Amino acid sequence: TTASATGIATLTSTGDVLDVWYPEIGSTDQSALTPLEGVDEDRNVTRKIVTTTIDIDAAPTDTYDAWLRLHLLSHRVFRPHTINLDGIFGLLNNVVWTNFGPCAVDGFALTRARLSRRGQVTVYSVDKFPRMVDYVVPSGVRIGDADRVRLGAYLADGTTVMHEGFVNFNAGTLGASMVEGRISAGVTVDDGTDVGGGASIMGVISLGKRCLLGANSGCGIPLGDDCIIEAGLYITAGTKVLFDGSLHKASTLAGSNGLIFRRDSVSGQVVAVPNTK
Amino acid sequence: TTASATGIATLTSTGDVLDVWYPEIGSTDQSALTPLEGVDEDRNVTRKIVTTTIDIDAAPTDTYDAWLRLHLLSHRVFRPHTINLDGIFGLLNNVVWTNFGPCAVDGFALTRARLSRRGQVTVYSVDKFPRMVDYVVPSGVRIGDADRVRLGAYLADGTTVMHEGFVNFNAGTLGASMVEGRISAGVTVDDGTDVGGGASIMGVISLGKRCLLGANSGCGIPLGDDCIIEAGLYITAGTKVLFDGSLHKASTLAGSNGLIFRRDSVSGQVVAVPNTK
Amino acid sequence: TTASATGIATLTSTGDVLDVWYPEIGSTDQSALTPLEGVDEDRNVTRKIVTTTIDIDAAPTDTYDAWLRLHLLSHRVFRPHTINLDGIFGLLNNVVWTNFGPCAVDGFALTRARLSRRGQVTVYSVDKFPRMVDYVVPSGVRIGDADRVRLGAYLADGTTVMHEGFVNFNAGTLGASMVEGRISAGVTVDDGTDVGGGASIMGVISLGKRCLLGANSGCGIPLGDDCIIEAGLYITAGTKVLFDGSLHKASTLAGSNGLIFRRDSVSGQVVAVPNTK
Numbered sequence: 161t162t163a164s165a166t167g168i169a170t171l172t173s174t175g176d177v178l179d180v181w182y183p184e185i186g187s188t189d190q191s192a193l194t195p196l197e198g199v200d201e202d203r204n205v206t207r208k209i210v211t212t213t214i215d216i217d218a219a220p221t222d223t224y225d226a227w228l229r230l231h232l233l234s235h236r237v238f239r240p241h242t243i244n245l246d247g248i249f250g251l252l253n254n255v256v257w258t259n260f261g262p263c264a265v266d267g268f269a270l271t272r273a274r275l276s277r278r279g280q281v282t283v284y285s286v287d288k289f290p291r292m293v294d295y296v297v298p299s300g301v302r303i304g305d306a307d308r309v310r311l312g313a314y315l316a317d318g319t320t321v322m323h324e325g326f327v328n329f330n331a332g333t334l335g336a337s338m339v340e341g342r343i344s345a346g347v348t349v350d351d352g353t354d355v356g357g358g359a360s361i362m363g364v365i366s367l368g369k370r371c372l373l374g375a376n377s378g379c380g381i382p383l384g385d386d387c388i389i390e391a392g393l394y395i396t397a398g399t400k401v402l403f404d405g406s407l408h409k410a411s412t413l414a415g416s417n418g419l420i421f422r423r424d425s426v427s428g429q430v431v432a433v434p435n436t437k
Numbered sequence: 438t439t440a441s442a443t444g445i446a447t448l449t450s451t452g453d454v455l456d457v458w459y460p461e462i463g464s465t466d467q468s469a470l471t472p473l474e475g476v477d478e479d480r481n482v483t484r485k486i487v488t489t490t491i492d493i494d495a496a497p498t499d500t501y502d503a504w505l506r507l508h509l510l511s512h513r514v515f516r517p518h519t520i521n522l523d524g525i526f527g528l529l530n531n532v533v534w535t536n537f538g539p540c541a542v543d544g545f546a547l548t549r550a551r552l553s554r555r556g557q558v559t560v561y562s563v564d565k566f567p568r569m570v571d572y573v574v575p576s577g578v579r580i581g582d583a584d585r586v587r588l589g590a591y592l593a594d595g596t597t598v599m600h601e602g603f604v605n606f607n608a609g610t611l612g613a614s615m616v617e618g619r620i621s622a623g624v625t626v627d628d629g630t631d632v633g634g635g636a637s638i639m640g641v642i643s644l645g646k647r648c649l650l651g652a653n654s655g656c657g658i659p660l661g662d663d664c665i666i667e668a669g670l671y672i673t674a675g676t677k678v679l680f681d682g683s684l685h686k687a688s689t690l691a692g693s694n695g696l697i698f699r700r701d702s703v704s705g706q707v708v709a710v711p712n713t714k
Numbered sequence: 715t716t717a718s719a720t721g722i723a724t725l726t727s728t729g730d731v732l733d734v735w736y737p738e739i740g741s742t743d744q745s746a747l748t749p750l751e752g753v754d755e756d757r758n759v760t761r762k763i764v765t766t767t768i769d770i771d772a773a774p775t776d777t778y779d780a781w782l783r784l785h786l787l788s789h790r791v792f793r794p795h796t797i798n799l800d801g802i803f804g805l806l807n808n809v810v811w812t813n814f815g816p817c818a819v820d821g822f823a824l825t826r827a828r829l830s831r832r833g834q835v836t837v838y839s840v841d842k843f844p845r846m847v848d849y850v851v852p853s854g855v856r857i858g859d860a861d862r863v864r865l866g867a868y869l870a871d872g873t874t875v876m877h878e879g880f881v882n883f884n885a886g887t888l889g890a891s892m893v894e895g896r897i898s899a900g901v902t903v904d905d906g907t908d909v910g911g912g913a914s915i916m917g918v919i920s921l922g923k924r925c926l927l928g929a930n931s932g933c934g935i936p937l938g939d940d941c942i943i944e945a946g947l948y949i950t951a952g953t954k955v956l957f958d959g960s961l962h963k964a965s966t967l968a969g970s971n972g973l974i975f976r977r978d979s980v981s982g983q984v985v986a987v988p989n990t991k
């Protein structure tokens with residue numbers, strides 16, 4: 161798809177792009193943006209309006225291109241896996257995310273000293289991906305600790321990410337989900353699926369609709385709809401699971417609808433049983 | 438109980454209450470508060486002094502009433518479950534919690550653009566419950582990551598909530614506890630009880646005094662005093678546990694004093710054994 | 715070792731040290747620092763330049779001494795366990811870590827009211843240890859949620875601490891590691907070791923090089939190099955593990971190189987098997 165947006169980029173003295181903010185997708189409007197253009201000599205950066213036009217099927221070719229792809233996900237214009245992100249790691253700079261804005265890692269000790277004349281400097285994060293909410297707050301969502309959702313995450317209307325929840329880029333919820341556990345990069349869960357406190361979804365892997373992962377559970381295989389994983393149980397692709405009298409690698413049960421995975425005291429095994437109903 | 442307090446409320450142009458701060462319980466004093474009254478045209482809100490009087494046994498009837506109930510818990514005036522919170526979810530607005538204060542979710546993209554003339558906008562959270570510490574810091578406590586304690590939490594003198602700890606509203610510690618795991622809404626633990634790193638207490642459920650939950654353990658049943666749950670073990674109400682030679686649902690062991698729950702290599706079962714001493 | 719540095723300390727009206735920042739180790743230079751000296755009457759503190767000289771083998775004797783020891787760790791001048799920290803808990807004050815800087819816990823409700831004339835007050839943490847990154851950002855690292863690394867942590871070049879990661883003081887990574895789980899105080903992991911999401915390393919305990927802890931795993935024993943612990947499995951020192959046909963307490967397997975710890979469906983036991991290769 162051809163996608164375009166006008167945004168405002170933070171650039172170092174040497175032209176490295178620390179960030180770009182696109183408040184809207186597909187708009188040539190600048191009036192939100194012209195008053196934010198300027199130089200910050202304490203951070204040694206310039207903020208400048210840019211217009212970015214990409215082919216979402218092509219691999220990104222520069223930092224601006226990469227930042228628009230992340231915005232397209234979090235604005236929910238594209239779902240996870242529907243936009244090419246190949247090489248994005250090589251295009252994003254590591255950045256010190258402060259209360260004054262993005263700062264370069266190179267020379268940060270001098271930057272901090274300079275900014276400290278203006279007030280207390282707080283560092284929120286040091287990373288190549290910023291906190292999603294500082295760029296887009298999508299409609300119909302709650303996030304308890306907004307450190308834990310990266311820009312590039314897709315959170316559908318009706319989603320709550322609790323404080324224990326975590327959503328990486330190119331990942332998230334396709335419908336209304338309670339997320340109290342970790343959605344890895346490249347993982348999606350569908351409508352009605354609830355991820356229990358401290359649960360881990362590895363990621364290749366997705367879950368369908370109305371699944372329930374218990375607190376401190378884990379899922380290393382794709383599942384379909386209406387599956388349950390008991391609290392405290394980690395189903396890896398290599399976990400041995402008893403189903404209809406034979407032991408299978410859990411990968412053999414990948415994609416299933418309507419299974420409950422639980423410990424079984426009678427066999428001593430992990431078991432998968434039908435979910436009724 | 439009749440409870441009353443004077444506070445300062447943030448109101449939208451249409452009268453929705455984004456927050457109320459009650460610095461003290463039971464005081465008619467305003468001198469902390471009159472200089473904070475005003476309008477913020479970038480957030481399109483007004484901050485106004487209010488006096489709120491409630492019956493703690495009655496269900497809350499408006500947003501102001503709901504916010505005082507949360508303050509009464511975090512100020513430790515009322516313990517969890519001793520104040521009626523029925524319907525509170527329907528009375529609290531979802532709010533964007535920023536470094537500039539609460540903002541409405543409706544029109545937030547315009548609000549952000551307006552505030553950005555003043556400085557970098559950071560969103561801490563998007564939720565109906567704010568971070569407790571921005572309203573009350575109770576005496577004798579430490580909180581590592583204060584994103585992870587909601588207003589409405591009760592933390593008794595001597596409590597440390599470590600970074601991995603989480604305490605929801607209507608929940609917390611009744612005495613001195615080390616909290617490195619998740620205390621769900623409606624859960625309490627009593628004096629001396631320590632919740633290990635990444636442990637999960639579901640919640641109906643409480644723990645008594647001097648209990649020890651190992652790292653990455655779970656507890657889905659009420660327990661009494663001096664119980665231990667081994668690291669990595671999740672005791673759900675349906676978990677089968679061997680005690681005095683029979684297999685029980687762990688719910689049959691609910692309320693016990695002095696039990697250790699651990700994996701047993703000899704039986705292959707979860708076992709509960711006496712804690713000596 | 716004799717270690718010395720010039721820093722700037724925040725002192726209460728009664729002389730309690732809330733913090734000290736040493737921007738550099740071993741320098742008599744003040745030019746970063748003289749403009750930050752002053753009084754803040756809303757917090758009732760003074761910020762003053764200090765020069766601190768210690769013997770790293772001696773127990774710390776005052777708050778200044780304690781804060782330099784933490785900086786020496788995070789600046790990576792000293793590795794964990796190579797600097798005496800005995801009694802440090804008794805020398806650090808509990809502090810309210812705000813967007814305005816450190817505040818005393820005594821009288822904090824008045825302080826908050828005073829600061830609120832200047833703008834929204836946000837409390838990041840309440841603790842004796844601050845967030846490392848507000849004092850030192852070491853080179854070559856990423857930290858997703860910088861609430862979760864305490865000052866006193868040692869993070870070697872090439873380390874990423876993901877959002878689920880946590881690193882305490884006197885703890886961390888000796889080489890390039892992906893940290894998505896909890897490194898307790900006094901725990902180190904060596905080069906190449908990756909700590910999976912939600913994994914717990916207790917701490918006495920270290921891991922060697924190229925170890926892999928699966929998501930939601932636990933490790934309560936020291937291990938050497940090239941060990942793996944399966945996702946969802948907690949190896950405590952008392953866990954019974956089958957190795958070469960006998961059941962051992964996992965403590966008997968402490969220090970091993972090249973072992974995989976996993977659940978075994980054939981025996982019903984935890985098993986340790988050779989890592990090939």
Ligand SMILES: N[C@@H](CCCCC(=O)O)C(=O)O
Pocket residue numbers: 328342343344345363874876894
């Ligand atoms: N696989 C983990 C950690 C890698 C994230 C990407 C990174 O290192 O930046 C997760 O997806 O949650």
Ligand SMILES: N[C@@H](CCCCC(=O)O)C(=O)O
Pocket residue numbers: 320322340605619620621622640
């Ligand atoms: N049961 C979980 C999540 C629901 C919290 C309330 C909510 O959705 O806001 C806990 O108590 O920690």
Ligand SMILES: N[C@@H](CCCCC(=O)O)C(=O)O
Pocket residue numbers: 597599617882896897898899917
């Ligand atoms: N043992 C835990 C909690 C204690 C930390 C020190 C404290 O209470 O401040 C950890 O090391 O992560």
